[PDB]
UniProtKB/Swiss-Prot annotation, chain A:
The lineage of its organism: Eukaryota, Metazoa, Chordata, Craniata, Vertebrata. Keywords: Acetylation, Cytoplasm, Isopeptide bond, Nucleus, Phosphoprotein, Ribonucleoprotein, Ribosomal protein, Ubl conjugation. Component of the small ribosomal subunit. Part of the small subunit (SSU) processome, composed of more than 70 proteins and the RNA chaperone small nucleolar RNA (snoRNA) U3. GO terms for molecular function: mRNA binding; RNA binding; rRNA binding; structural constituent of ribosome. GO terms for cellular component: cytoplasm; cytosol; cytosolic ribosome; cytosolic small ribosomal subunit; extracellular exosome; focal adhesion; membrane; nucleolus. Belongs to the universal ribosomal protein uS7 family. There is a cross-link at residue 34 (Glycyl lysine isopeptide (Lys-Gly) (interchain with G-Cter in SUMO2)). The modification Phosphoserine is found at residue 129. Gene3D superfamilies: Ribosomal protein S7 domain. It is found in: Cytoplasm; Nucleus, Nucleolus. It comes from Homo sapiens (Human). One of its GO terms (biological process) is ribosomal small subunit biogenesis. The keyword rRNA-binding does not apply. This is Small ribosomal subunit protein uS7.
From Swiss-Prot, chain D:
The modification Phosphothreonine is found at residues 42, 70, 220-221. It catalyses: 2'-deoxyribonucleotide-(2'-deoxyribose 5'-phosphate)-2'-deoxyribonucleotide-DNA = a 3'-end 2'-deoxyribonucleotide-(2,3-dehydro-2,3-deoxyribose 5'-phosphate)-DNA + a 5'-end 5'-phospho-2'-deoxyribonucleoside-DNA + H(+). Optimum pH is between 8.0 and 9.0 with activity decreasing sharply below 8.0. There is a cross-link at residues 90, 202, 214 (Glycyl lysine isopeptide (Lys-Gly) (interchain with G-Cter in ubiquitin)). Its EC number is 4.2.99.18. Keywords: Acetylation, Apoptosis, Cell cycle, Cell division, Cytoplasm, Cytoskeleton, DNA damage, DNA repair, DNA-binding, Isopeptide bond, Lyase, Membrane, Methylation, Mitochondrion, Mitochondrion inner membrane, Mitosis, Nucleus, Phosphoprotein, Ribonucleoprotein, Ribosomal protein, RNA-binding, Transcription, Transcription regulation, Translation regulation, Ubl conjugation. The modification N6-acetyllysine is found at residue 62. This is Small ribosomal subunit protein uS3.
From Swiss-Prot, chain G:
This is Small ribosomal subunit protein eS17. It is linked to Diamond-Blackfan anemia 4: A form of Diamond-Blackfan anemia, a congenital non-regenerative hypoplastic anemia that usually presents early in infancy. Diamond-Blackfan anemia is characterized by a moderate to severe macrocytic anemia, erythroblastopenia, and an increased risk of developing leukemia. 30 to 40% of Diamond-Blackfan anemia patients present with short stature and congenital anomalies, the most frequent being craniofacial (Pierre-Robin syndrome and cleft palate), thumb and urogenital anomalies. Component of the small ribosomal subunit. The ribosome is a large ribonucleoprotein complex responsible for the synthesis of proteins in the cell. Part of the small subunit (SSU) processome, first precursor of the small eukaryotic ribosomal subunit. During the assembly of the SSU processome in the nucleolus, many ribosome biogenesis factors, an RNA chaperone and ribosomal proteins associate with the nascent pre-rRNA and work in concert to generate RNA folding, modifications, rearrangements and cleavage as well as targeted degradation of pre-ribosomal RNA by the RNA exosome. Belongs to the eukaryotic ribosomal protein eS17 family. Transmembrane segments: none annotated. The chain holds residues 1 to 63 of 135 of the full protein.
Swiss-Prot record, chain H:
One of its GO terms (biological process) is positive regulation of cell migration. The modification Phosphotyrosine is found at residues 51, 227. The 7 WD repeats mediate protein-protein interactions with binding partners. The gene is RACK1. The lineage of its organism: Eukaryota, Metazoa, Chordata, Craniata, Vertebrata. This is Small ribosomal subunit protein RACK1. It comes from Homo sapiens (Human).
Length: 191, 104, 141, 227, 141, 76, 63, 313
RNA sequence: CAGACACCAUGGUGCACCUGACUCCU
RNA sequence: CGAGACUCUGGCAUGCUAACUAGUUACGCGACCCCCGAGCGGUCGGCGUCCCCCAACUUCUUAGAGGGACAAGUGGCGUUC
């Protein structure tokens, strides 16, 4: 443990952080070697505290939405650590590294901001932040988890693991691959 | 013979309560009794929620008044008569001072 | 009698006092180890600094802790801040500045702030709204 | 405390005696220039001390009125014989006593004097006795069905934050008219805010006093004396 | 030691079997049909919770100085679901929880003692610490 | 110790009381009178004393009328 | 951004400098206790802002 | 004269190292009063990595320890701290042997005797309290005993005479006799309020330096003025060496050290680096102390370091 | 300075009022 | 004048003052005593209970005085204000 700290049941090591912009917004083993994702119970104290929070801890944060599910991280970290188990038995890979790849293919490249042109709808081909690229990755990952479980035999962990695996390698069966591309569609589009 | 007399002090004015509790502890040692000290019982916050707007069409304006009373006791291993004799004299205003035969 | 230091670890309303008494004993949070009460979902949090410091620092003392206040989660940091501070305060007065500093050096790179108090409490509630910052549902024409 | 009313209830019940007494002696001792009361809890004696600017009507002749002024207080409000011992209090200043002044201005406004002229007389006089500020408001209907407000301010009046509450002496009087009610609203900001002795809430929070140095200079050579 | 050193959820089930090893645990005449609590939408799955509830009571009274009827009724209940209204905590049946108490008193697992109610029997202090070791040697959660 | 008054009749103060309320000496007493020229009978003033040999007379020499005023010796 | 120094600190600190430029220093807890010694400030926090701006002034004026 | 090369640096402090003290038994002990409300004991490694290791933390005040003084053996720590209390610590463990409540304001000074009984403290309460080791304030030297803040009370080595050489913020040095507490002399005629004062290590000569920083020399056996050794910058600490007459001035831009028999400047131990802001730039030596021998010149600055100098030609 | 510019109508009522003095007799 | 200043509160005071309507640790630690475990067993350590004291302390806790926050600091920037 003082040599290397791993995940609660997985390894923070053997994690392939393989994007260009998303360096040091995705870290699980670099400074963020955590068996237990919980920093202090707040993550909006600073704008800096976004990159302080790792993607494994923000996933436990960005899940508890939907007011009956708000204020429940203990249900969440249960279901989140359940979801890593459902990754590995479907993959065999490090389920953190699957989650780490899930941020990669779900992060956009160019998006669009609104602009006006002659009354007609045009949108400006802009980059988004690699902070936002992670935040557009996680939020689309967190959307398909509770939604697909909401009237199905599958729990959120089974839907979130399918959400991570199909976004670890873009299969267009996770919600995050399917909605990133519509964001990236408008950049090469209008004007 | 000594007689462990509680001196219970109740007030709402703290520095009035403090300047009298200073008189009781010193005056018990000025003319010799037990001196024990301020056993700080917690204050009681009397909070009452009121309406700020009578005939309250418009905005629901709530108004809360608090009143804080302050308790403490001073148990004195000291001879029963001259416990209450030295202490209860010379303090009329501002502060209730309750010397007490109990905790015998 | 045996040598000891008393400390505290604090969340919003949660003070856990551990006496890090000399001898051979556990980290007895309310007389029992941490495999008890069952929150046991933040269980890697409170078990983390003992692994990073070694149990022999905590087993060269008896640590019996009195804990009160808060909820289940508020007490988990309250005991983790305390027994971290118990180990610092034991070596600093009795044994050595160097080990407790190394204990302070080990605790602080992941930085759960296990040695400083935290000013976060519940914010005082004002009227005119069902929430501490949120207000009622408004109606206009 | 057992078996009385609560210690919570007791300090509630202490002001309940204070309110009904002050309202009633507003209704009757305003003829004294009612500045207030002072109920002093003494052993075997309720030392009531009547603050007023005309204490020549408290006894009547030979202590006549006190034996019915106490007989209101001593008999209705729960006191034994010899407990309520009445005392006068002819307050020294009255121009720092806006309560007695909005009383006394009501002896010039409802009692009869010109509107500005009585507010020239008293507002000077409460400044003549001394005021850091002193203001007079007569608010409401005047000259028919139209509401008016007559502001007569002298000295400095502050309103910021916390020291608005400490530094002033305020009086509101419901003067009844043949056409309505006006409010004689007289506030006097205390001249004994940084002084007298000293006044409330350490001298003014917008102000800092320093001492003069008169040190650390010398023409002398270093030369000592055994002392 | 205590029973707080061993696994509490194993303890409420190993002592439940120990009350089945007692053979009698003085069940009331009404558990096949009862509401049993105004918290519960359904009647219980069985009757063998009553052993577990007394296995949860005798563990509770091992730690107290003594307790009784009202104290058990806050333990096993929770949010009373108020339907179209907001749910709130209350207390269910005070008869079957007292029937638990008179049972463990009747078996001398707990016993009417000081601090207003039932504290441990010293036989119970054996038989809890006996099955505490049976809890502890089996598994340690 | 002062004997505050709302009126104080003709032996008012300021060497009208240096031999009347008491015999023992005082410091100084304010009166609204200018007590040499008018010989005006007026009371809105006060009476300051030292209270060593003054208390015995004025509490039986209260409630009275030297002229047509009313001496209220209320001591405080 | 906030709690910028108003008229009350700067006018008070100026009189303090020109009279006490020996007995003022640059340590706050000196000058805070010096503004305890030489000044009558109705708040510790106001004395924190004054004597701190004295240390702001004393650093400036010793240049 | 001789010189001083930088023997090393001390580490491990929070806030300004307000005083430093060697005990006569252990020159390898330096007790460095820092602004961390807890003085640190240092058993000197005399290394090149550090010069010592943190030995104890004498844990706890409400404010900062300005002056510190050790027992002559090296067993007790008198942390005269700005919480109003001097606290006599068990320097080996922690463990206040005596907290000295009674100074109503920030305890500026503390002195502990060669008798190892006389505790005299000066404070911002403008009092000079001759304490005992049990906290018995044996006498509070008042009544023209520094009518300004009592800056630093200093012992002549009390086998010579029972003298407190007390400097003050009243630009005076009130030199007393002890156990009668009448002035041996008031040293009159100083420029600037006297931040520090020293004795010659036999109680023989008195040197006084302060705000203006003119090291005015006095025959301490007489209270008669020798001369004014010239500094000019605000002296924060004066100390003759115990092995020779080297008085050293802890000043603003440097550490002016001299030879005092005869009057010549030995070196000037610099303390400045290139960090131009420029009202924020210079640090100062707020405390210098010699060794137990007078070989190592310890200099506890405002930079959380005590740079040391063993005298090297 | 040095990239992209659409239509959008209506609507109503009372009080701003013309002089000085200070024997409160303290 | 407002605002600021100011009040009160959240924080920071193992300093400091007090405790038998608070307690705490501390003993001898026993006792209900469990061997559960070590220890053969005592003892140890043990949740409570209590012996608890003429222990101790205010750490928890209470409430009292205080101090701490002032770019104050540093290092850039800014009329360098």
């Amino acid at each position: 443990t003082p040599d290397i700290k791993l995940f609660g049941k997985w390894s923070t090591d053997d994690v392939q952080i393989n994007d260009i912009s998303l360096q040091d917004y995705i870290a699980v083993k670099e400074k963020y070697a955590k068996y237990l994702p919980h920093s202090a119970g707040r993550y909006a104290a600073k704008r800096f505290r976004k990159a302080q929070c790792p993607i494994v801890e923000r996933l436990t944060n960005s899940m508890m939405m939907h007011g009956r599910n708000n204020g429940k991280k203990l249900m969440t970290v249960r279901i989140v650590k359940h979801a890593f188990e459902i990754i590995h038995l479907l993959t065999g890979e490090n389920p953190l590294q699957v989650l780490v790849n899930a941020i990669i293919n779900s992060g956009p490249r160019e998006d669009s901001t609104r602009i006006g042109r002659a009354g007609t709808v045009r949108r400006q081909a802009v980059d988004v932040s690699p902070l936002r690229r992670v935040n557009q990755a996680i939020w689309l990952l967190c959307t398909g988890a509770r939604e697909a479980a909401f009237r199905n035999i599958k729990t959120i962990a089974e839907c979130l693991a399918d959400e991570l695996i199909n976004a670890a390698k873009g299969s267009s069966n996770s919600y995050a691959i399917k909605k990133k591309d519509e964001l990236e569609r408008v950049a090469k589009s209008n004007r | 013979a000594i007689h462990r007399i509680r001196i219970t002090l109740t007030s709402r004015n703290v520095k009035s309560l403090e300047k009298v509790c200073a008189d009781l502890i010193r005056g018990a040692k000025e003319k010799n009794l037990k001196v024990k000290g301020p056993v700080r019982m917690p204050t009681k916050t009397l909070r009452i929620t009121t309406r700020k707007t009578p005939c309250g069409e418009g905005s629901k304006t709530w108004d809360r008044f608090q009143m804080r009373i302050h308790k403490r006791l001073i148990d004195l291993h000291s001879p029963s008569e001259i416990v209450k004799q030295i202490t209860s004299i010379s303090i009329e205003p501002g502060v209730e001072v309750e010397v007490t035969i109990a905790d015998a | 009698p045996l040598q000891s230091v008393q400390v505290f670890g604090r969340k919003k309303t949660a003070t856990a006092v551990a006496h890090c008494k000399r001898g051979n004993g556990l980290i007895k949070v309310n007389g029992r180890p941490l495999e008890m009460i069952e929150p046991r979902t933040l269980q890697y949090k409170l078990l983390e600094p003992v692994l990073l410091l070694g149990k022999e620092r905590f087993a060269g003392v008896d640590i019996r802790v009195r804990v009160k206040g808060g909820g289940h989660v508020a007490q988990i940091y309250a005991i983790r801040q305390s027994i971290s501070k118990a180990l610092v305060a034991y070596y600093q007065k009795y044994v050595d500045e160097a080990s407790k500093k190394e204990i302070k050096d080990i605790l602080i790179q992941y930085d759960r702030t296990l040695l400083v108090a935290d000013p976060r409490r519940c914010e005082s509630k004002k009227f005119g709204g069902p929430g501490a910052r949120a207000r009622y549902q408004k109606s206009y024409r | 405390m057992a078996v009385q009313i609560s210690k919570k209830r007791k300090f509630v019940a202490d002001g309940i005696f204070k309110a009904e007494l002050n309202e009633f002696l507003t209704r009757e001792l305003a003829e004294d220039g009612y500045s207030g009361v002072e109920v002093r809890v003494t052993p075997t004696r309720t030392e009531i001390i009547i603050l007023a600017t005309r204490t020549q009507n408290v006894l009547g002749e030979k202590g006549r009125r006190i034996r019915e002024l106490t007989a209101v207080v001593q008999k209705r409000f729960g006191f034994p014989e010899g407990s309520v011992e009445l005392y006068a209090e002819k307050v020294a200043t009255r121009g720092l006593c806006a309560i007695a002044q909005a009383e006394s201005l009501r002896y010039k406004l409802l009692g009869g004097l010109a509107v500005r002229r009585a507010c020239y007389g008293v507002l000077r006089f409460i400044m003549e006795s001394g005021a850091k500020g002193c203001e007079v408001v007569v608010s409401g209907k005047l000259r028919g069905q139209r509401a008016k407000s007559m502001k007569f301010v002298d000295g400095l009046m502050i309103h910021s934050g916390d020291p608005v509450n400490y530094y002033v002496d305020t009086a509101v009087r419901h003067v009844l008219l043949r056409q309505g009610v006006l409010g004689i609203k007289v506030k006097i900001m205390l001249p004994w805010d940084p002084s007298g002795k000293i006044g409330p809430k350490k001298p003014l929070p917008d102000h800092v006093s320093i001492v003069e140095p008169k040190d650390e200079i010398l023409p002398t050579t270093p030369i000592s004396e055994q002392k | 030691v205590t029973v707080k050193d061993v696994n509490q959820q194993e303890f409420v089930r190993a002592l439940a079997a120990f009350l089945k090893k007692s053979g009698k645990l003085k069940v009331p005449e009404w558990v096949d049909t009862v509401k049993l609590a105004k918290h519960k939408e359904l009647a219980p799955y069985d009757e063998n919770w009553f052993y577990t509830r007394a296995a949860s009571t005798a563990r509770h009274l091992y730690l107290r100085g003594g307790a009784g009827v009202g104290s058990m009724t806050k333990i096993y209940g929770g949010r009373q679901r108020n339907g179209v209204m907001p749910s709130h905590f209350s207390r269910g049946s005070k008869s079957v929880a007292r029937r638990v108490l008179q049972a463990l008193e009747g078996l001398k697992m707990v016993e009417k003692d000081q601090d207003w109610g039932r504290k441990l029997t010293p036989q119970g202090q054996r038989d809890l610490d006996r099955i505490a070791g049976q809890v502890a040697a089996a598994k340690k959660k | 110790y002062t004997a505050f008054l709302g009126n104080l009749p003709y032996d008012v103060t300021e060497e009208s009381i240096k031999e009347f309320f008491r015999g023992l000496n005082i410091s100084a007493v304010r009166l609204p009178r200018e007590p040499s020229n008018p010989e005006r009978l007026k009371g809105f003033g006060y009476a300051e004393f030292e209270d060593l040999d003054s208390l015995l007379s004025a509490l039986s020499l209260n409630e009275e009328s030297l002229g047509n005023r009313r001496i209220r010796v209320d001591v405080a | 951004m906030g709690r910028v120094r108003t008229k009350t600190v700067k006018k008070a600190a100026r009189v303090i400098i020109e009279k006490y430029y020996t007995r003022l220093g640059n340590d706050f807890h000196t000058n805070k206790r010096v503004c305890e010694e030489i000044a009558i400030i109705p708040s510790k926090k106001l004395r924190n802002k004054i004597a701190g701006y004295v240390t702001h002034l004393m650093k400036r004026i010793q240049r | 004269t001789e010189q001083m090369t930088l023997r090393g640096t001390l580490k491990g402090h929070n806030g300004w190292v307000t005083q430093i003290a060697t005990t006569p038994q252990f020159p390898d002990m330096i007790l460095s009063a820092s602004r961390d409300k807890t003085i640190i004991m240092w058993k000197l490694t005399r290394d090149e990595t550090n010069y010592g290791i943190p030995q104890r933390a004498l844990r706890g005040h409400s404010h900062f320890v300005s002056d510190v003084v050790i027992s002559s053996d090296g067993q007790f720590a008198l942390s005269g701290s700005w919480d109003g209390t001097l606290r006599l610590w068990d320097l080996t463990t922690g463990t206040t042997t005596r907290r000295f409540v009674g100074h109503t304001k920030d305890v500026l000074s503390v002195a502990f005797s060669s008798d190892n009984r006389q505790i005299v403290s000066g404070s911002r309460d403008k009092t000079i309290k001759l304490w005992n080791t049990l906290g018995v304030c044996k006498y509070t030297v008042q009544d023209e005993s520094h009518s300004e803040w009592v800056s630093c009370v200093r012992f002549s080595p009390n086998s010579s005479n029972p003298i407190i050489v007390s400097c003050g913020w009243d630009k005076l040095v009130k030199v007393w006799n002890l156990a009668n507490c009448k002035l041996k002399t008031n040293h009159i005629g100083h420029t600037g309020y006297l931040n520090t004062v020293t004795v010659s290590p036999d109680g023989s000569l008195c040197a006084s330096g302060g705000k203006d920083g003119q090291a005015m020399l006095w025959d301490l056996n007489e209270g008669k003025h020798l001369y004014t050794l010239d500094g000019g910058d605000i002296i924060n600490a004066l100390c003759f060496s115990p092995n020779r007459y080297w008085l050293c001035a802890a000043t603003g831009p440097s550490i002016k050290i001299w030879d005092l028999e005869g009057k010549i400047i030995v070196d000037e131990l610099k303390q400045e680096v290139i960090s131009t802001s420029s009202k924020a730039e210079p640090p100062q030596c707020t405390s210098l102390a010699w060794s137990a021998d007078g070989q190592t010149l310890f200099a506890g600055y405002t930079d959380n370091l005590v740079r040391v100098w063993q005298v090297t030609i």
